Design an enzyme around this catalytic site. Structure first.
Site, short mmCIF file in Angstrom:
data_model
loop_
_atom_site.label_atom_id
_atom_site.label_comp_id
_atom_site.label_asym_id
_atom_site.label_seq_id
_atom_site.Cartn_x
_atom_site.Cartn_y
_atom_site.Cartn_z
N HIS F 47 0.81 -1.25 0.00
CA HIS F 47 0.00 0.00 0.00
C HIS F 47 0.83 1.27 0.00
O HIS F 47 0.24 2.36 0.04
CB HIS F 47 -1.00 -0.04 1.15
CG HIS F 47 -2.19 -0.86 0.77
ND1 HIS F 47 -3.09 -0.44 -0.22
CD2 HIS F 47 -2.60 -2.09 1.18
CE1 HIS F 47 -4.03 -1.39 -0.36
NE2 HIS F 47 -3.74 -2.41 0.48
N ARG F 72 6.14 -6.24 3.87
CA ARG F 72 4.90 -6.74 3.27
C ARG F 72 5.04 -6.66 1.76
O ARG F 72 5.09 -5.59 1.16
CB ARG F 72 3.68 -5.96 3.76
CG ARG F 72 2.43 -6.35 2.99
CD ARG F 72 1.19 -6.06 3.77
NE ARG F 72 0.86 -4.64 3.77
CZ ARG F 72 -0.26 -4.14 4.29
NH1 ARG F 72 -1.10 -4.93 4.93
NH2 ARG F 72 -0.56 -2.86 4.12
N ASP F 86 16.34 -12.17 -0.39
CA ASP F 86 17.76 -12.05 -0.80
C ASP F 86 18.28 -10.65 -0.47
O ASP F 86 19.45 -10.59 -0.14
CB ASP F 86 17.98 -12.47 -2.23
CG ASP F 86 18.01 -13.99 -2.40
OD1 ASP F 86 18.51 -14.67 -1.50
OD2 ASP F 86 17.58 -14.48 -3.50
N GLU F 151 -7.95 -11.51 6.29
CA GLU F 151 -8.57 -10.18 6.10
C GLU F 151 -9.62 -10.25 4.99
O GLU F 151 -9.92 -9.20 4.40
CB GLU F 151 -7.44 -9.17 5.87
CG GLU F 151 -6.56 -9.46 4.67
CD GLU F 151 -5.55 -8.35 4.36
OE1 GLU F 151 -4.65 -8.62 3.55
OE2 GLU F 151 -5.66 -7.20 4.93
N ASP F 177 -9.25 -4.17 5.30
CA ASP F 177 -9.70 -5.13 4.27
C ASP F 177 -10.86 -5.96 4.85
O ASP F 177 -11.82 -6.25 4.13
CB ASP F 177 -8.56 -5.97 3.73
CG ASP F 177 -7.78 -5.25 2.64
OD1 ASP F 177 -8.41 -4.85 1.66
OD2 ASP F 177 -6.53 -5.13 2.76
MN LIG Z 1 -5.08 -5.22 4.39
#
Ligand SMILES: [Mn+2]
Ligand SMILES: [Ca+2]
Ligand SMILES: [Ca+2]
Ligand SMILES: [Mn+2]
Ligand SMILES: [Mn+2]
Ligand SMILES: [Mn+2]
Ligand SMILES: [Mn+2]
Ligand SMILES: [Mn+2]
Lengths: 253, 253, 253, 253, 253, 253
Positions: F47, F72, F86, F151, F177
């Protein structure tokens, strides 16, 4: 703040919008194009070396100008679509759409749950101005515009089915991909290709959807405008930069 | 590896070289210009948003093509000149040179000690290909070209004195700065300015130095070429991009 | 938080510190160098294509490692010295210092008013961790280290006067610039140059200042360490990358 | 297009403008600050890690919003001032101005020849929108605003002389530099410093110039506004980000 | 202009090409590698922090040098393969290919319609030099080279089937991935692994395809070259930089 | 060098860790957050406008500080997971996990062959410090932490099945979400949503897995901490920057 009104989306029903392709992949070049007065600018994430960050810089550059930004992702990738919507792209052009099933997935990808599958992160999004658009999550979907490309034999084979998808605002014809698919690569001007393009525009409009196309050929572009085509891109920044510099050199050799 | 030969520098004595100004400040746009076939490309560090790192990117892009790179630093700054030579710029264009004393300092800024004051760091320099050019420190000075701009009243007041500086390879006239200095800002085409420009070209060439100029006006550029001007820039990438996009939109409004 | 202790500065009086020159001008390459275990890394803003922003990226990379960062600005420029201190460089290496007057200016450039002229902006500085180091403006000066280079005839002509400047922590000899200044460009190994370097190291140390030097010649570097030289850089990342890749290819041609 | 009107410059005579310091040195962070509704944003090229290119990105971000951009160069450097004006900065804040002679040079640095010394390159400049502002060279000077900082004992020693310079639109007091200069480093709140600040504001306004200051202390900021101070910056993005994250953590430790 | 001839692709049938892995992920480091004289350079988009834009910068750097560029995408992703071909990579190395079906998809991903599925955007592509290569869409496919990696048990289980795919120019063995797949992670040197590698090289060549491999072990690399392996990479820039800096420090501890 | 110990992973069993979301997408802003003292920082690739290269810059900034980095990715994409591991991310947070089959694939994506499918390239990886961590390929898997988000309704429909996946270290609830999926978009505070969240936390912890959540609502965050939630993010850098700047301006309007 109120959500940014998507004038491109409204004008699909009220006028014919003239576009410029933006493939110079840079915020500075995008701002130059934004000063000219095109109805829409296409930031190309498919055929120019762009990513989410370079597209964001170009959105920020263009945002001070009336030209409406449209973004083309590299493919109909749901997570990439999520990322482009959150940086504030309000109109998407999805390449190589080939079925009503794929077009429907693209509709959902652009809409918040529970009706769609757009991931929710309004605190982090330029799209919501980091929630400084206080009602964004209520008003967002209304200003999103989905355009899909028909530019393969399979796309033409599923044209009527794609045109029956609620949420597809426009169908854009890609002459380069479509002429290559038809076995006339590099030669979209052939009558066999052009007759298919004209019939396709007529079918798109008959179904109440906006029709679109790109052509750098002024005569073809004007013919498409005469047929009522709603969104017509008439050149490409890379091509105009190269041609303008070549034409100038040729005066001096 | 042998030091890159400065063909721009040699051709100052054997032909008239046609140039394009590169102010789009990006490696991608510099490569587009490099494909056209100009004799020289001017990477502008004075009037385009460039720094050492963005100029390096543009030198790397252009290096695959025969067009010769010339770099204009923001001013006659000795340490910046050192930085530009080390990333591998072989021809510099110094703006606003106003005295023989300043032109001599610019000569020294481009040459290694003990004759000059160019800082020595060949292990670190693209210019030496990190010493992969084995004899760089012996062969470097021969391939460096110094151009200085006369573009103020004080420059014109010291023209004969600048023209007697050994190591100044060329004098470039800046019509925008010069017309503004003369009180005709935005109007270099005025006879009062053009007579000074023509007389200045004649004096530069009479002293055995190369004369240069930029004009986006085709008639003026061809007049300067008729007068024997050795290095003539005939347009600007930002201007050509804007003009090409505006001319196209005007066909559709 | 406590101000970051300048261990490089302390160790000038307690040990001989081994250095690596960092001219790859990138945060990723700097981190690779930071893993090896050098006492100090020299981020070169004079002879590598660096600016305040690229130097900041390299300070951030190196910061997780015990190697002490030293930064070389392009010149003894007071405002640039201000910028480098605020991004948090605690040890500076000033090239081409040629007088006690210039060395004194460099001392003041590194120290807050009222005793120095370092510009005050602790709310904005990585150096203060944006005032998360609560007493930064009281504790900053104690952890700043100034090194000046003697690498010209005029520097040698002012050596005793530079060595009497309080606040000069170390004098670094630049063999590339000095050998060029002496008319032995590319040949610092000549006895005429080496005898001057050895005498200079002895005078630096006799005056209670730290001596430093760079040599990629292992025998010269070990001779300098046997003479007690406090800070010795023994190689350059660009040179080691090129040589390592060339030696490997030579096994296969 | 018409030249962008400099509303900051007009409002120096009509209201008190509230400012936010922008030192996060990034187009994305600048856009976040631009959404809040400050009268002016100060893009800091002195105490944040900015250069011409990173300042350009922030101008492009902010340009879609009503907040007026003001740029602080690292020093009163004529060529850097030229570069910042051409990327489209219309209001400059020059640090550490210490004489009427220096203030006069700053006036000329912001004005085209023949009256000033601003270098002419309108074909290349975002400032002219690449000459899409067709009369830029005639209308530019009228929209440029010059602010100078008094923040040293020498500045205070030349205050009356600086206030008599035609073309200085405003004098900004720098409490951090000025308190350090006065031997109260980190302690501008001392009565000895504050009495000098208040007398200085009164003198600036008595001479018909706009007075400015930054203070993150709400009580001091409101006192300066009560005294009629025309441009008051009331916080710093780096400081607000750090403090907001620390205050939040302290609720959970 | 003529399409750039793919000499790497030709030499698969005429000689043994020595390679260097490029994982420093930067245009400047790639240029250093390009100066050494390797037959091929592998720009790693799988195991180095690269994206389309950083890969483009490295193609532009290398382009001035005879070393042939090969690009490894992160996976066999059709849209990413499209993006890499358009920025002008002419040889691709696809990791983790496990079936004739996947290899056939990779062949089509590299070829224009109607025979393949490579998206058409020659006006925007560095690959066509923005259509300055006038017959690009006719001449492109002939200069594209596809290499696939066998480096899993499933790849070995489908080796004969992959070797019968027309349009697979070469099969590259990945010893790190293969030894891990075989339960000898970090130990490719074990006889069990090496016997499988040797048998695989012999089968690749028996089927008339080029074989390739990376080994930083000089003895293994020379054994692979004695077996006739056509494309052998013999080291990695990150590994050579780290080892060279460590070996140097060890002379001084 | 020894592999970096994953303290976040250990502390899942010994304490409650307080987190800050990092969506400013920049190494400079990530360092500011790193100075505050949060137990964990979430670099958001879903996001916030991040890619592998911008995430690497943020890992390098934070690495000097004790705060543990969690990344994330935009989706549960196996090759992107390979890339993030990595560059050295040791804890991943996978959004929108909806089945035991998908959670098992994410476990395998984080572990080397033969047990998992993580691609092997330790010579090139910041994660191994380019093999300067001698035994990385043996010690890596032990320090990797996998978190998955529940979610959606489908995630809740498969909660018991996801909780029986060995190798899922934690389940994080996404209220934005989840509330949208439940038809309360923008309204997670509703009892209907909160009862589901509380029951979900209780089930996660009953199955012996760590539970996590983000809430910018102080009361809700403290309730989740009272319920034993192991990893609680309590704010977002973009939100705190915007709110702090708005609250300040409101004191002056
Ligand atoms: Mn979310
Ligand atoms: Ca820069
Ligand atoms: Ca990127
Ligand atoms: Mn297409
Ligand atoms: Mn000029
Ligand atoms: Mn030197
Ligand atoms: Mn100040
Ligand atoms: Mn592999």
């Amino acid at each position: 703040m109120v959500n940014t009104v998507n004038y491109f989306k409204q004008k699909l029903k009220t006028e014919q919008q003239i576009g410029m392709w933006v493939g110079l992949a840079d915020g500075y070049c995008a701002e130059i194009a934004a000063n000219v007065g095109y109805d829409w600018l296409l930031i190309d994430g498919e055929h120019a070396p762009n990513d989410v960050r370079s597209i964001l810089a170009q959105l920020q550059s263009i945002a001070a100008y009336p030209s409406q930004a449209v973004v083309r992702p590299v493919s109909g990738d749901v997570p990439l679509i999520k990322q482009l919507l959150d940086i504030g792209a309000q109109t998407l052009l999805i390449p190589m759409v080939e079925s009503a099933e794929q077009a429907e997935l693209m509709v959902k990808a652009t809409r918040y749950p529970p009706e769609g599958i757009r991931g929710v992160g309004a605190a982090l999004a330029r799209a919501s101005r980091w929630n400084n658009i206080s009602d964004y999550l209520q008003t967002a979907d209304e200003q999103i515009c989905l355009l899909v490309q028909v530019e393969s034999k399979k796309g033409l084979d599923n044209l009527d089915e794609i045109l029956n998808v609620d949420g597809v605002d426009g169908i854009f014809i890609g002459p380069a991909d479509l002429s290559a698919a038809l076995g006339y690569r590099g030669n979209p001007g052939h009558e066999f290709v052009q007759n298919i393009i004209v019939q396709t525009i007529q079918k798109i409009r008959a179904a109440g959807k906006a029709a679109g196309i790109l052509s750098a050929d002024e005569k073809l572009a004007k013919q498409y405008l005469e047929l009522g085509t709603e969104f017509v891109a008439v050149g490409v920044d890379t091509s105009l930069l190269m041609k303008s510099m070549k034409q100038l050199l040729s005066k001096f050799k």
